[PDB]
Paper text:
CtfAB then transfers the CoA from acetoacetyl-CoA to acetate to reform an acetyl-CoA and produce acetoacetate. CtfB contains the acetyl-CoA binding site and the PS01724 signature sequence which includes the catalytic glutamate residue (E46) sandwiched between two short antiparallel beta strands on the N-terminal end of an eight-stranded mixed beta sheet. CtfA contains the acetate binding site and the PS01723 signature sequence.
L25 and F24 of CtfA form a hydrophobic pocket for the methyl group of acetate (301 A). The methyl group of acetate (301 A) is 3.9 Å from the CZ side chain carbon of F24 and 4.0 Å from the CD2 atom of L25. On the opposite side of the binding site, one of the polar oxygens is in good hydrogen bonding distance (2.5 Å) to the side chain NE of CtfA Q98 and 3.4 Å to the side chain ND2 of CtfA N50. This oxygen is solvent exposed and connected to an extensive water-filled cavity. In T. mel CtfA, there is a contiguous hydrophobic patch between F24, L25, the methyl group of T78, and F54. This hydrophobic patch could provide both binding affinity for acetate and improved thermal stability. While it is clear from SEC and native-PAGE that multiple higher order oligomeric states of CtfAB do exist in solution, the heterotetramer is the highest-ordered state apparent in CtfAB crystals.
Residue numbers in the entry:
A (entry chain D), C (entry chain A): 1 to 213
B (entry chain C), D (entry chain B): 2 to 215
């Protein structure tokens, strides 16, 4: 069965896990899963996400509790506690352009070895990257981003684990679901098979290993 | 008033049916000043085409926000979508206009607008993709950082992109980067051309056409 | 003003155009648009599609009438006439693995300079492709495919031009809609704005230039 | 019968909950022999997860087909999607099994199944992505082509890819490619070890355990 109790998180998320976590500034993030990780001090995590949200919400609760050793994000400006830990050197922060982050995570979920993007050419993000020219235009080679677990949020799942998202809560969730070794989806509602139409489903249940609440 | 002067002049640049992305802050004021006869479509990087104004009280949806996590509405005909698609719209040239804030813009047309070393380190979010991929980049910014010119010969703060922005609008002038450098097309009715040049470290080509506006 | 008469095809599809045409063996192909092309004998086309369908269906009709100088496809084996013109030299047949074709078109639509794929490594596909090793594995560099016009099929459009697709007729259509300079969508029904939900639309109207029937 | 023998034996390799892609032709017969007790989900490259059998007459939908454009059904909980997503599944390692037909297999586990020079040139379709991406590739093919062996030292016909397939199933033999050579695991009970070796050009390791049942 895919649906399991939330108390089971302590068993599927290890200390030192590389984790993708859905959400944009806390919108579409799996708050209950995050709350379980805090409850059990699961630490030395590497978190790949759009951002570290705010100090009081979402991924920010992980930084507030110092459970991250590294974050791979595009934005940290809304969370002074992240910047503080970055300046003090206890938190390694890797900044990625938000569109490059989407494509690199998608590349891993889709089986590509990499993508060429024009974004960040001639900026500090070119540093340590291979440059490839294609018809006399420069692109950076940006590499797939893998993770042990995807912690994602969805609006509903059907009995087979098919998911749908809602409005701007979608963002990174369906792409992280293809990219991680195991996918755990927090959902708001479990609905009957045949409630989600084939034309509407955005993540097939085959890729979802676990579901909570 | 200067933040309003800039917003009104930028809103005049918008054409009917364009897909527009406004950056947070000064550029979002652009939305208050569009003609009541120009219909535009607003994109937000977190995954919506068809964004609308903030909801009336009680009408909020926890899953519908702008790129600041502030509550918004969606207008009829909106599409919401994942972040791969959202940056396909931005990076792929399907965005007609971006209005972004600025820290410096040089005579190469290059914008610095995500970081000041030793002060701000918020990360770059969508700003690098947006500057690179929009059909048109409009920088909306105050002319000076407390008298220190913000339009300069060459950027000293980190580059958002090497792409040449298309228009600069400040409280004093409208400048269009070109292959020959910066072209000053317009100046505010409340200023004077000597003061504009005085407050610009970069070299301006003055237009034969020079207009009075903003 | 997106909806136009089928006659407007002749202002929009030029001789020698490079065209993306949606459809999987003729399922989800814009048959009416293709029939107008044949009626005005618009020729020397370069057509990017999954296949040349069948001799009397979809894209195969354009081949029957010798309207293509070149096809970039993944499969031609259901259409003997494509094979006969190929063998005589009249038709240039570039074969691309279906999945690489999907990513080469998508790269053009989303503004990437290329993608690294492990498909085709060590086969005839590797001919004349840069090879890139990432973490000790080989990938073929595959490059974006552009077109002048995309001719796509969809089930419905709303008044704003947002599109939804039906079942396995979706295939290449939404990908091609992002990749070409101009996008012309053949649709079965026009429905009021608000019939298609923000959570259901697959192609925004902002990228659709014209709609036929 | 020869195609039956192969299809039945392949069908015993499938496990509950597996996402499976069947090539058209011989492999599609595998779906007639799935044991009750085993529920699997079928993918078709043209864009469905949850493919079902052909519709009863009058229940056809022109928008719902397999990868040969023949009419199919969708089972409850099916998903349909674009060709980028479909090959994200295939190339991204989310497909548990693919059963494909065969022209040759060689002693490195290398499959040729998309082209005969001079004779047949249909193009590869999705076959290259399927072999390079699936978690497990099972080749289902008749042991010889008019007496000519198809299991050979080095593929002579063009390769579908360099990935080592995980199992070969013919009407006479079950062969597992390994770190050092093709391992004969099973023999059909209408045949003999001697015939299988007369009809195989490639070198075969023979298993201590050596089972019967096609």
């Amino acid at each position: 069965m895919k649906v399991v109790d939330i108390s089971k998180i302590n068993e599927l998320v290890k200390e030192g896990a590389t984790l993708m976590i859905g959400g944009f500034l806390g919108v579409g993030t799996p708050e209950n899963i995050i709350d379980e990780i805090i409850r059990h001090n699961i630490s030395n995590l590497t978190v790949i996400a759009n951002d570290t949200a705010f100090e009081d919400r979402g991924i920010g609760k992980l930084v507030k509790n110092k459970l991250c050793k590294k974050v791979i994000v595009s934005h940290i400006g809304t969370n002074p506690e992240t910047q503080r830990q970055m300046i003090e050197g206890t938190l390694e922060v890797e900044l990625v352009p938000q569109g490059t982050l989407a494509e690199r995570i998608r590349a891993a979920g889709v089986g590509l070895g990499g993508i060429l993007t024009p974004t960040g050419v001639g900026t500090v993000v070119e540093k340590d990257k291979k440059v490839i020219e294609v018809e006399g235009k420069k692109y950076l080679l940006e590499l797939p981003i893998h993770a042990d677990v995807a912690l994602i949020k969805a609006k509903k799942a059907d009995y087979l684990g098919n998911l749908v998202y809602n409005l701007t809560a979608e963002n990174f969730n369906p792409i992280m679901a293809l990219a991680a070794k195991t996918v755990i989806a927090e959902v708001e509602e479990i609905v009957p098979t045949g409630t989600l139409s084939p034309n509407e489903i955005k993540t097939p249940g085959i890729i979802v290993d676990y579901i909570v609440t | 008033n200067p933040k309003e002067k800039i917003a009104i002049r930028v809103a005049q640049e918008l054409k009917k049916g364009q897909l527009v992305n406004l950056g947070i802050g000064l550029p979002t004021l652009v939305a208050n000043y569009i003609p009541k006869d120009i219909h535009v479509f607003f994109q937000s990087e977190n995954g919506i085409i068809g964004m609308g104004p903030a909801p009336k009280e009680g009408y909020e949806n926890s899953d519908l926000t702008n790129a600041g996590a502030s509550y918004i509405t969606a207008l009829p005909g909106a599409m919401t979508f994942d972040s791969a698609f959202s940056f396909g719209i931005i990076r792929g040239g399907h965005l007609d206009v971006t209005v972004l804030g600025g820290l410096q813009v040089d005579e190469e047309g290059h914008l610095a607008n995500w970081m000041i070393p030793g002060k701000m380190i918020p990360g770059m979010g969508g700003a690098m993709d947006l500057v690179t991929g929009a059909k048109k980049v409009i920088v909306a910014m105050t002319h000076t950082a407390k008298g220190t010119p913000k339009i300069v010969k060459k950027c000293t703060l980190p580059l958002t992109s090497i792409r040449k922005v298309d228009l600069i609008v400040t409280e004093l002038a409208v400048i269009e980067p070109t292959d020959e450098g910066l072209l000053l097309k317009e100046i505010s009715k409340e200023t004077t051309l000597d003061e504009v040049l005085k407050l610009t470290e970069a070299k301006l080509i003055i237009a034969d056409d020079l207009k009075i506006f903003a």
